[PDB]
Amino acid sequence: PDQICIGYHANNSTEQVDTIMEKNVTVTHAQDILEKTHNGKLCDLDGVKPLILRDCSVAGWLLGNPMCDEFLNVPEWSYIVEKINPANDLCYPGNFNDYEELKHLLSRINHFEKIQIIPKSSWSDHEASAGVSSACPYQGRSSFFRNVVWLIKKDNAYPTIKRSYNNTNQEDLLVLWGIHHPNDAAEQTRLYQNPTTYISVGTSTLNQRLVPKIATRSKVNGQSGRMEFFWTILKPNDAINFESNGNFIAPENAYKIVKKGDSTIMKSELEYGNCNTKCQTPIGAINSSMPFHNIHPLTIGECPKYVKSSRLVLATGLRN
Amino acid sequence: DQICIGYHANNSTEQVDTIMEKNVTVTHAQDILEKTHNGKLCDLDGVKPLILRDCSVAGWLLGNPMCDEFLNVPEWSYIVEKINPANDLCYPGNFNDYEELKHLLSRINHFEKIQIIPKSSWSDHEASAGVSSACPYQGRSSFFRNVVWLIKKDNAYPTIKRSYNNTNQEDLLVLWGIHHPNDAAEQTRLYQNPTTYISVGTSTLNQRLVPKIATRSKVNGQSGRMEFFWTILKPNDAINFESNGNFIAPENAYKIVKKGDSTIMKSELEYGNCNTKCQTPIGAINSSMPFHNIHPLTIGECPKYVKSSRLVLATGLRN
Amino acid sequence: DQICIGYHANNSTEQVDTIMEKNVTVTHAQDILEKTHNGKLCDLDGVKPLILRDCSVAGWLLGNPMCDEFLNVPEWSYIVEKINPANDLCYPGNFNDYEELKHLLSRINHFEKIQIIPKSSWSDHEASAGVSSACPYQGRSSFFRNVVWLIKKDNAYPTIKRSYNNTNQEDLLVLWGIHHPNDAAEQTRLYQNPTTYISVGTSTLNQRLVPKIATRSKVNGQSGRMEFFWTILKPNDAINFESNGNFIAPENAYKIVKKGDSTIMKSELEYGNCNTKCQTPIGAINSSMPFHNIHPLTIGECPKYVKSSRLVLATGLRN
Amino acid sequence: IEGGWQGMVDGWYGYHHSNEQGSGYAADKESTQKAIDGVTNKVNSIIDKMNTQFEAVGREFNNLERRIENLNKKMEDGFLDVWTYNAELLVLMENERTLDFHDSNVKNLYDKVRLQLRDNAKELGNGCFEFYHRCDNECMESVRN
Amino acid sequence: IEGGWQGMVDGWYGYHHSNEQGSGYAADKESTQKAIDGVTNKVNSIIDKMNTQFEAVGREFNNLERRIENLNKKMEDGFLDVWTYNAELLVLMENERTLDFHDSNVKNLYDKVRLQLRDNAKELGNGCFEFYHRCDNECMESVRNGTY
Amino acid sequence: IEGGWQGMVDGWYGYHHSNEQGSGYAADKESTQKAIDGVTNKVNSIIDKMNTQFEAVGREFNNLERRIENLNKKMEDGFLDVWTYNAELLVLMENERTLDFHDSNVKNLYDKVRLQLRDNAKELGNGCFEFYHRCDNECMESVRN
Numbered sequence A: 001p002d003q004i005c006i007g008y009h010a011n012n013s014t015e016q017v018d019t020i021m022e023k024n025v026t027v028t029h030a031q032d033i034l035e036k037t038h039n040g041k042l043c044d045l046d047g048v049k050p051l052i053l054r055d056c057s058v059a060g061w062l063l064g065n066p067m068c069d070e071f072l073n074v075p076e077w078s079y080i081v082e083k084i085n086p087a088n089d090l091c092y093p094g095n096f097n098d099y100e101e102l103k104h105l106l107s108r109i110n111h112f113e114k115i116q117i118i119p120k121s122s123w124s125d126h127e128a129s130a131g132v133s134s135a136c137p138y139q140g141r142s143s144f145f146r147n148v149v150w151l152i153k154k155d156n157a158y159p160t161i162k163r164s165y166n167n168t169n170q171e172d173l174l175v176l177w178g179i180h181h182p183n184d185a186a187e188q189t190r191l192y193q194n195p196t197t198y199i200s201v202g203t204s205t206l207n208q209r210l211v212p213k214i215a216t217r218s219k220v221n222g223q224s225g226r227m228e229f230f231w232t233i234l235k236p237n238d239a240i241n242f243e244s245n246g247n248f249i250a251p252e253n254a255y256k257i258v259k260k261g262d263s264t265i266m267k268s269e270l271e272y273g274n275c276n277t278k279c280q281t282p283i284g285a286i287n288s289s290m291p292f293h294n295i296h297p298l299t300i301g302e303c304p305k306y307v308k309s310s311r312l313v314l315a316t317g318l319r320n
Numbered sequence B, C: 001d002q003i004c005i006g007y008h009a010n011n012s013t014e015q016v017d018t019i020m021e022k023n024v025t026v027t028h029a030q031d032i033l034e035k036t037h038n039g040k041l042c043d044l045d046g047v048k049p050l051i052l053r054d055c056s057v058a059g060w061l062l063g064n065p066m067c068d069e070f071l072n073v074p075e076w077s078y079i080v081e082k083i084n085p086a087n088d089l090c091y092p093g094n095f096n097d098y099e100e101l102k103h104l105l106s107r108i109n110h111f112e113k114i115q116i117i118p119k120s121s122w123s124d125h126e127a128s129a130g131v132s133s134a135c136p137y138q139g140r141s142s143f144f145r146n147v148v149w150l151i152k153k154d155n156a157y158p159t160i161k162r163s164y165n166n167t168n169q170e171d172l173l174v175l176w177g178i179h180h181p182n183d184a185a186e187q188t189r190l191y192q193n194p195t196t197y198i199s200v201g202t203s204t205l206n207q208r209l210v211p212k213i214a215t216r217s218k219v220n221g222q223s224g225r226m227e228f229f230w231t232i233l234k235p236n237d238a239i240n241f242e243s244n245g246n247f248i249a250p251e252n253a254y255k256i257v258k259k260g261d262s263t264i265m266k267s268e269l270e271y272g273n274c275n276t277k278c279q280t281p282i283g284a285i286n287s288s289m290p291f292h293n294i295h296p297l298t299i300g301e302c303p304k305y306v307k308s309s310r311l312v313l314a315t316g317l318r319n
Numbered sequence D, F: 001i002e003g004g005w006q007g008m009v010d011g012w013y014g015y016h017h018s019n020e021q022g023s024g025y026a027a028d029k030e031s032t033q034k035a036i037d038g039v040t041n042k043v044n045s046i047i048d049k050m051n052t053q054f055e056a057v058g059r060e061f062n063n064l065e066r067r068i069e070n071l072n073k074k075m076e077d078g079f080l081d082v083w084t085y086n087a088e089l090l091v092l093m094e095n096e097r098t099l100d101f102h103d104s105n106v107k108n109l110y111d112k113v114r115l116q117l118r119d120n121a122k123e124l125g126n127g128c129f130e131f132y133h134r135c136d137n138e139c140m141e142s143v144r145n
Numbered sequence E: 001i002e003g004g005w006q007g008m009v010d011g012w013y014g015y016h017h018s019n020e021q022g023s024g025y026a027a028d029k030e031s032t033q034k035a036i037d038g039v040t041n042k043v044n045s046i047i048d049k050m051n052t053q054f055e056a057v058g059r060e061f062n063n064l065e066r067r068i069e070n071l072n073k074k075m076e077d078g079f080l081d082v083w084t085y086n087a088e089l090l091v092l093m094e095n096e097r098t099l100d101f102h103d104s105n106v107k108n109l110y111d112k113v114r115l116q117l118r119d120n121a122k123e124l125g126n127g128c129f130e131f132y133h134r135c136d137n138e139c140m141e142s143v144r145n146g147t148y
């Protein structure tokens, strides 16, 4: 009549897990290890506010599109946020040469310090103030990129330009310039006098010679002319030498690279959220002790490990 | 009175593998790897592929006279090109950004070819003398169908200024070229003007080409070269050509009518008059297996490729 | 009377890991990860590598006077170049498609250098004045060995028209360049003609170069630049140069004599007078292990690389 | 057991009884039913598990794009090797688990009968049990049921 | 066993005794203590094992870089699939090992008690033992304490 | 069992007998022979299984090829991590299977002797058996054989 029995625990839990052998197996206790929730906004990363470009593109920012005056001298940033299709890009139509490569450098950079290298008042024999277009409006008038100068002829003359800037700073220097491709020979001589023109640019590594490309093009922002922009990193102690007899979009301001580090250029339609986080995705921030998450593959910060799984649950107790 | 526990057995010789053991014979074994294909190129879910046979993509698009079969092709499921097509650029030269074009083409299922610049449009230039023995057609010198080799008329080549506005709803693939002659004599013989250029503009394109006179080796009996360019002219944009020589003008262009999953398959096989759910360049597959090892590059609802020669699951007990 | 079942044991302290358990002591344990290398660069299966020492691939191929050691190298197993070789382009400039050339070079085991255009061939141009203090040799201004910096003779630079037909059975690597001067004065001083060009044609190549006059920073005391180009001239094809200035003509070219598995290894080590089956840039490996963690980039019959610090199999029972 | 019997082809597992009335085989339908469902469940899960593996794409490069061509080739071959390893390794795991699952069911059926008649029977050793109190066809079924 | 008992909520494994005095549940603290440590050790190791997996990076390509853009996309999706497979498969391996680990502890506890009273008890079959000599509350503890 | 015996150094598994004549160790050659072959088979299969893993290649990019350089680096590191995971995980699977394989052989040897003398012996519990009818050296061998 006296007896003893061996057994195990049970309860009224309905939580289930999977196994290689079996699926849909109910257990007493189960530990979820996948984070599925984000806060839905863009935040500071470990107390450092990101650069939110809003309606401007990286190009518009760096060149100084008049619509982007907000970003003339930005503070240090943790990451950069650009919309999928920013409205304020190259106000005057054209292209940025090696633009994706520049953006890659920018993802390694945390802070610029903008400095003027060629004052606008420096141009004695050329007109520096007439270089404006209705394609780049500012407060209801024709304007132009802030950081570069569209020089044109003065007194029906465009003498050959020969300018050098020696980077006497300790920082690497991002320098930008451009060339104007006019619509026709008439426009060419109207603006620059000389019919056949060129732009030479030299550094210790750079050896450029550009020639304008006159052609009939479709109007973009009411312009059939085009402007093509170029860039380079002028190392400390090197010099850059410009020479031109027309179509030159000269540098005015350049960017000292002040801080490097882990950064990214995030594509997102979200705005600044007035939050702080350890882990950002383009779709929202994450505060989680979970080892995995499935919010978004592209992230920055101390984050959990991304997976494509919808569900991920560990067994801790026994089966029922 | 007694009861005993036991298990099944039979005379099967089928064997399987294990992490512990190899060559282990069992009663039943389920093969899950497909090793057999039908050995020919087929329709993909009832849609016939474009088999280029001896022509290359370039030869097709430009209209090499040997490729007249493909002047107006119907919708296709995938494209098949040989490893080294015989009929390419009959007149020697190159196609600019050719691999990029082929990549677009792998996203496209149907073109509709339209004429944008009639050959009769050229009043002050000769449109019909632009032919070469490098591009024979029925035993006479011919040229690419879809572009026009303009030359001087009455010892004159006046500056050309032509625009075409894409009034269609479709993206438009437009093609043109430049002729690089052998010498200054040839230059003036064909185009009169010694120093020449070609300007091409759209809302996105800003081109200015200049010929490159040079002494080159003969290819298909020609030391001259022709370099071809392309662009996608978006609906409502216009393309503006200007030139005083060496211009290979567009005649026909391609309206992009349908996009989707397609591929450019490299294969030496011909059309097989079959239909399949899954094609490889080496043959089609009709299989309920989860895996296969025929070929990595496939298109359609296919099993999962692996490099394994053998793959067999255990279903029964061991001997 | 009695009988008992038991198992082996000993005084070993070697431990292994398990998915369930960590730090588990067993009787015997088989290490399968190689952690040791010999620390030097060796022959690969009896074939000595090409150690460039202070020279770069460019310096070697063009014939930088500091690299005279490598004027005619024997067959090699692999190539070793330092992270930042001192002897590169002595005269400042760049090598066009240099990384692509280096990729070809990693498929090549032996060149045979031949002269294709003798330096005495230039009757109407000066072939011997083309030298610079940027390229010193034994305390005097010199220049790249395998190419020739032609300059004007008797205040004249007549148009050059030279062809070389590759009559050899081997593919031929040919090299040439263009000189970009500092100013119009330098241009006319050296080449007489103010506006100049270089045309180069093969069956595949159609080049036209124009110098780029500009004010540049001094590199090795030169503000001028030289830009180098290359091509593989197939057996029976010909290469045709034409120029009226700024031409750096070929003198020597390289016959591709043997192809095979090779690599361009980046390493600061010197030749070690050893032989091995497996080389890394950090040292050679002689090991029967299936894994190793020395360095990911290797050549030869090597074990399989992993990032693991430790890797130990259980052979026999726990204690 | 010494070995398996070719005789029974009814189910996978089963009993054989000797009795004063007669003798014959009898497959355990409860054990065979749960076994056939178990193996069929796995063979389907292996199909679903691998269904999001790498799909290779033809790409074309020119003769000055040799580095990227090589990168592309190594990349596609890399994944194809990775998933071929996962496939091969998965099959050896599924197979090993199948054979151990069968040997598990044999022992679990021997222990189930032994637990059902503790003091009323004698375990011989070769996978058989001798009843102490005599057991007719109805009791045989009662042990099976 | 036929099934598990809702009764005991002390530990995971345990005993239930019937006796002349009374009857009640009693959890094995020695068995439960080693079990709680074992599962907590595993859940942490799965976190550490996957921490060197692939981290994807935004890259940008222009409209004449379509081939490389595609290569990049396929590459990143490739690894994300690979590690998602490793993650999913690892969880099914950890789960399977958890449930077999529990069934292992039940049998090991049944064999421990059976070995402690060989000839002095009768194993019924349903996971219980009938004592031959009657056993009061102190003996029950003595069977449980591991000193019977 | 309480533990393993340092005494026997003949084989991996074996018997120890107490007897009116004397006492000594005795390794099971049949069990040890199949065990030595089993482990040697595995250690070789782990070598063959990983032999088609990723092989990394030096590539060079210029300073305006930074995006592809990065892609290349991430790709090669990606596979090297993937295969390092497969290698590490495979070793823990092989190790675990080795130790369970040994504990399997001990129990299978204890059950083999127990099945050979059912009613003629008494199982103590600590991994030993007491004969009811006395058993000399020849019978010990007969139990071993």
Ligand SMILES: *[C@@H]1O[C@H](CO)[C@@H](O)[C@H](O)[C@H]1NC(C)=O
Residues within 6 Å of the ligand: B022, B023
């Ligand atoms: C496995 O079986 C095949 C026969 O189909 C045989 O060729 C192979 O050698 C066997 N494997 C081993 C390790 O013996």
Ligand SMILES: *[C@@H]1O[C@H](CO)[C@@H](O)[C@H](O)[C@H]1NC(C)=O
Residues within 6 Å of the ligand: A218, A219, B165, B166, B236, B237, B238
């Ligand atoms: C093309 O034609 C349409 C219809 O006349 C017009 O709206 C559009 O502006 C034209 N575009 C160009 C670039 O000429």
Ligand SMILES: *[C@@H]1O[C@H](CO)[C@@H](O)[C@H](O)[C@H]1NC(C)=O
Residues within 6 Å of the ligand: A166, A167, A237, A238, A239, C217, C218
């Ligand atoms: C720039 O300035 C420094 C400091 O005087 C000088 O040494 C250097 O030569 C200059 N750079 C160039 C390219 O002339």
Ligand SMILES: *[C@@H]1O[C@H](CO)[C@@H](O)[C@H](O)[C@H]1NC(C)=O
Residues within 6 Å of the ligand: B217, B218, C165, C166, C167, C236, C237, C238
């Ligand atoms: C080069 O020389 C061979 C042999 O004389 C000749 O047959 C061949 O046509 C030549 N190649 C070229 C490109 O002229």
